[PDB]
Amino acid sequence: SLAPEDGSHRPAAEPTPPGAQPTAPGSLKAPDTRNEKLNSLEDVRKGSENYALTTNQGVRIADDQNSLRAGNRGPTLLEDFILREKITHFDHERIPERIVHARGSAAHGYFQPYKSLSDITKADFLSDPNKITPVFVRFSTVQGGAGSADTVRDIRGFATKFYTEEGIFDLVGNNTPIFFIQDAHKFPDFVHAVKPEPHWAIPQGQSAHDTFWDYVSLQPETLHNVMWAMSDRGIPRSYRTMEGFGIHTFRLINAEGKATFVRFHWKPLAGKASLVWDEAQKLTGRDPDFHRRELWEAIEAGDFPEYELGFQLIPEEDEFKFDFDLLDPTKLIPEELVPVQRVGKMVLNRNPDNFFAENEQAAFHPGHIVPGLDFTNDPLLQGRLFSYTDTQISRLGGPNFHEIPINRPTCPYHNFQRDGMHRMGIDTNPANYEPNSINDNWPRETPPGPKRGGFESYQERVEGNKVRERSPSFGEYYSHPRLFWLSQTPFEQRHIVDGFSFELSKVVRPYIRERVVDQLAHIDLTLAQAVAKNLGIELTDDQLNITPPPDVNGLKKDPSLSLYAIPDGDVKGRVVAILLNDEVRSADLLAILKALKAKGVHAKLLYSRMGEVTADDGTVLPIAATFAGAPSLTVDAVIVPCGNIADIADNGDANYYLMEAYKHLKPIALAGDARKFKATIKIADQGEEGIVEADSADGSFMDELLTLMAAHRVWSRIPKIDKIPA
Amino acid sequence: SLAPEDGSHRPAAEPTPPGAQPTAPGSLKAPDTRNEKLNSLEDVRKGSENYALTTNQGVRIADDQNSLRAGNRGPTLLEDFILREKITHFDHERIPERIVHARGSAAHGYFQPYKSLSDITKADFLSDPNKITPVFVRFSTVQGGAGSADTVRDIRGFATKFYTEEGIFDLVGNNTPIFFIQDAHKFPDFVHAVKPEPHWAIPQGQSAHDTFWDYVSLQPETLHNVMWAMSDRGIPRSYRTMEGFGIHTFRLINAEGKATFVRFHWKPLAGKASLVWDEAQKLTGRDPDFHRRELWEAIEAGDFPEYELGFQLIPEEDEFKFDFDLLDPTKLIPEELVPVQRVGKMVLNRNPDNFFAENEQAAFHPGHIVPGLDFTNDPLLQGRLFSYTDTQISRLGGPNFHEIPINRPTCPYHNFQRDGMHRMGIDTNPANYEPNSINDNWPRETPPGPKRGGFESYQERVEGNKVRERSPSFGEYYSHPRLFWLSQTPFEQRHIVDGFSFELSKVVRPYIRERVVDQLAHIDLTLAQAVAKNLGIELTDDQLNITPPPDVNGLKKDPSLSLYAIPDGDVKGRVVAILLNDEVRSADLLAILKALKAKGVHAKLLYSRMGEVTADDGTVLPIAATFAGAPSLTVDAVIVPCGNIADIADNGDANYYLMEAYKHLKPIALAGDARKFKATIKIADQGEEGIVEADSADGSFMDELLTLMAAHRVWSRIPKIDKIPA
Amino acid sequence: SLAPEDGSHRPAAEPTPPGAQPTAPGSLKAPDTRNEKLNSLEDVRKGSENYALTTNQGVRIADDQNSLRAGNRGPTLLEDFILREKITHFDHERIPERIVHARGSAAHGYFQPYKSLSDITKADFLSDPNKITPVFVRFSTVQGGAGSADTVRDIRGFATKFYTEEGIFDLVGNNTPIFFIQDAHKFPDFVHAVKPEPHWAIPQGQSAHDTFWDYVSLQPETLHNVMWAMSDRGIPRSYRTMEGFGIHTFRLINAEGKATFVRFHWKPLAGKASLVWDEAQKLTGRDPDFHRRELWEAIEAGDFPEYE
């Protein structure tokens, strides 16, 4: 027995806060958390405890430490079938990664509608508020490989597999409401431009290079989603604190055949929250797995990610009532014109057991719809429908990818398809064709109907010639980028300017920078001027005379486009660094932990070494990490209790902890003699907004700190941080 | 609903004779035939009756007759996901065929030992006479593709997968006791030589071409298995009427660690029986699926193929007591020297449900042994051990081929292997490595022991230098071919001569023919002279002075090497053609069917058209096939009952039916006026051996016929038919 | 060394009648028969005479008769990279066969127009009678596997790859002027019905079984091509003596933008000729390679297959 006698190798199978215990496969951490999909996977789940180690053929292995050789210092023998089986499997472990969205993190959960939607769709999973649908959700970046970092600047994917009683419905969306391009024919062009450049395969996980901004400067249709990527939307704090969008206009079809246009939305119950660029970039180095880890640990703690599904609904007769084309995926539908109507709630409440088998092998595809839904002529969606089926033939090894366990429907499936690589289902049907008499034509077609009916496309009218031709209605590129820009707060606008500025400074060919700035001048001249000055570029008289695009149906601002104009952050599930010393004032720590617990805010106790320190009252404090091992990047706020402050007052890592937190706009609280640290962050004796201070951590101290946390970051501090060397 | 009103489209779930009803998947035909392996496949079996037709994602299909198009005479739309899924799966149905043995037919069954063998092997499946082991068996040819013909002249494969309680054991044998080559390094050379030639990919299923006999003439080690292939061994009547052999010397290991050398044997309880060449070749045209069909119908009839497993056992100390090397796979062990000791019986009693899923994807490999068995230094076996693992990576699409349902062990299997294409098992082990503490080192190694122990190789001595060198003890090539030749009956010797002569006549380069005849002169000069005469080659004086090779340990013959020298026929499961007329004597037919039923012999009612005829007593007789639809090639004997013989007496197909049956040495029985057909085959008034005749089909009539059938063929007829125009 | 002294191992590099000499790879039988496509393949052609036997990495092999073992009667060693490379390549020789038309025989040649067709099409390979276009043609059956027999009753495929100056044009036709079904959505149903039945994978190369005629009886659109299949059209004497059809109506587009509907035809210069059924069936047994052999030997004899 190699496990420690005290059983400390095994995490408790109950919810525990981040860092308290080692993480674990979901079936071991939360065995009582069940749903119909999780239950259906039991046939393929493999145990381990009390089993003998065997080959894949079931032969018990006596010595898993040695190859078979002629003498114990001799050559290895070809007849060692145990060695060759073990190494052969190792040698073939890897499969192709996803062409895009290769980096991602996934969890199990369930969805429930608030009310029956039978009046607008016959989709069974939306038919009854008591009907629970299991889901599997994968969040992702777009550009980088499966081994790339989480907190990059990028669009994020938000893919949901609904295992409904009438088939699998995949809602395959992103965290912004539009995409970069209009027609799917250009997807390889755009993706090649953003991906690592082909001669040297640089840069990973970044749009900050020549070919991306070359394409952008020549394809102004990209400018709307570029604006979103350059905002703090491109660097979310957590998959739990971003929105999701289906982007395309789809259709809802009801039992009477009536079609309603719909765009899909996910709204996070934890609110919207993002990092700042310097923090996000440094965090890809200090913890490239930050979002994967934060998602997994939130679920292990009971901080289940929750999202509200919502519909923007447009009747068929309103198709042409907007300044933009509903079928153009570079255009958003402003919520001020078409509100998001709440539909239901999705809870993610259990992690996978095996990342590769469940996450890496999962296959989502927006062509997977169910009766009650349909497509539109959106020309980006139209080409998507080809790609997601085609790409699985190489990525997952052939056409039986629906038999990979995570991908299997939980409802029945029967047809006349046969064979293919790794075929699992053994069909007993005498017939493999229809029409047939020898099996009385089973399985049989089903007419469409109000429930449990066959799928039939909505019979929309098609008229025109066969043409490769962009719709003229799509030929407008600046008004929605302007609407987004003018919907942001002044500090969000600064971060957008600084996003463009940072990225264009990495473009080696200066004329590309100049051409992008010219595009910006067609959107908004305050933005263009601010970027140009960071690039040493002077706008011309003609550029300063470019007429701005008009409002979007009278809108200059839509409040739903800003992350922060109306703060909506829940503090539950956030985390606070507590900087210890070797004789902490226990009365301070008591008040701190009392208040954090009451708000569901987690804490990590940090010090200059691991092990334990003893407080002034004799309490033994276990150390979660060192100052350098868990940097301020990984937390939302910092608190310094009183005690033997001299122990850490001269510690360079402790002082830098506060300076980095200060620079990144995080709330900081200093008790007692810890107020001496104000000098390090250049805070005057009188204090300033965003720095909590008092003689001791009391009731009022922690209310002030948690109020700051509710507002996410201290935006008023921005004018001071450029003088801070951090 | 498209089935006939009378519900007659479905075969009965009961044993029925060949051709009576449509064949069916094994689960429908015999649902009460069960074993542990068949039962374990129920997780992946799919039904069909009373289910809706769906996509692979579970969406019900309304119209499986049409593509989605813009207008009913317009272009097909990319958004038709139902069409594209269906065509995508069709487009990727095929997987690589096996490099060799691509043509094969398989069935389920079970094995049982007669008595515990624990005195000589600790293998669990041989430890207890009440231990039932499920098997899956695949028979095959070698050279031809998966769509080539069954009754070619070739070696046959005989592979048995044992699903034992201590792991999968694959016994991967052929139907002759030796192979063509000594060292696995030459296998691609030999296989390329026998396969279709690389410029034009001709000929399929035939060794009768230049490159095969080129290789043979230059590699005399091949001559022994060539002898077997040129005998009637190369054209079996049925997979049920041939022997099986493991070929290699293996080892049995008992609980005290003693090693016994062993060669494995399968003896057919239906006896040994082969076709003749003209019949076998024409049958590849009239029914290329004859062996596959015959096996399937025998099982549906309850004529379960049975085979006795036997062991040739040689003590370790007798390794060098023979004239030949025990580890040389071109040498057989004469049963006159080492008898085959009976071990157990295998019964094949159920067909698969889906050929592709169960047959095409099954993976056998002789490196799949279990504790109680081990290898030897046989250099052909040694290289086999590398091949069977390697080849599955492309054939079955990755390293998880053991998770394909037919390949799965029924015993537990757990290890630290992970991922790979189409990974099915979802591991919950916190550890994917050992030694580990975090899962207390589970799954754990098992020390070797008398039962349920871990695998450990027999610690045989290895001594010598690293050399690419053939053992000198392998360098004798003619003694065993000569022993085989001398052990055959005179008519079997004639058929060997005719095999060589026919094949070498299809060799275009005459010098190759001459070099092969020269090799034959080193085996036996009678054989060489007879083949040379058929090729217009005259032996030289030097060739006529070649000394014959020595006897094999004093043996002048070994009758176990002949198909027919020692009678072992068994008529159960054979088939007789009954040639009908439009008013058959019901008394003849009554006595015929009665007598066949008492011996388990089946009958096929044939006529000049399909439909029905009525006997003289009003019995309506359904017709199974026409004379040309089911030629005499497909049956073991022919009976012509009395009645309105004028109806068929001038029918050309009926007359040729008897001429073909006569040429191929099959018993024929003629009742009453059917004796007019004696004129067609030139039988004398007084009769001849092999022709049954009487005033009526009485009981003595049928006893003579069934006695002939038990002798398989009428060998005394050969000189008569050597001049038959048929 | 191993060749006979009289040189009779090697066929003459000039036309010879069927059976007179061993058949050979085309570059060795007819080294002076060229076209632009055949020449463009010289970069990947590999010789053999006077070269050393090597691994795929270029290492010369001294002993290609034996595995490396510990003693000449010992176990084979894992370090034998020459053995493992040779067996690995053999172990992975096969690729998936075509879903349909898996059985097929092919040759090189060229195409030339009789006159300019600029009035009705701007296709460059039809622009004038001096446009020489290399082709590669594959004839096939439909139902059987790659190792099935040639002279089955079946439809035949007739596929031509034109290597034109403005891109590849594949004319993928059959030897009858229609197909069995109207809408591609039904293709897996029809093909599954004619193919070997899924429980036992019987019969090979034959429509003569229940599921095919079940489908036919329930889908009368199939009856026209069934009539052709049941006629002697279904058992051609040679790929040289059958017609070819593109089946579909396509379009020709000229330089002025005018569209003309077109159906494509191949007419055999050797005339139309078919077997009779008893002969065709027995011949699948006596020589399952008859059509492949006959095509190859015709070309080696100089009886070049020609089609208008």
Place this chain on the structure above:
Amino acid sequence: ISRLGGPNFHEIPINRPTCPYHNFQRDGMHRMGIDTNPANYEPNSINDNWPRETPPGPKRGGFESYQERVEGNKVRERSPSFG
């Protein structure tokens, strides 16, 4: 075989030898080399046994393993000297 899609990975340009290579190996996925050898096996007479084995020698010779001594029993055992 999985990473590069089959046994012809030596035909991918960067992997190709710059020296000659000839043997009797055939087919495999994405096979680039078109072999004109009448034979795909050795020993053969129909191509006078080309390409031919080469004896080991001081230069341009065939590969032959060093004939080091092997002595022991077939064991799965670590050498004590490694401990």
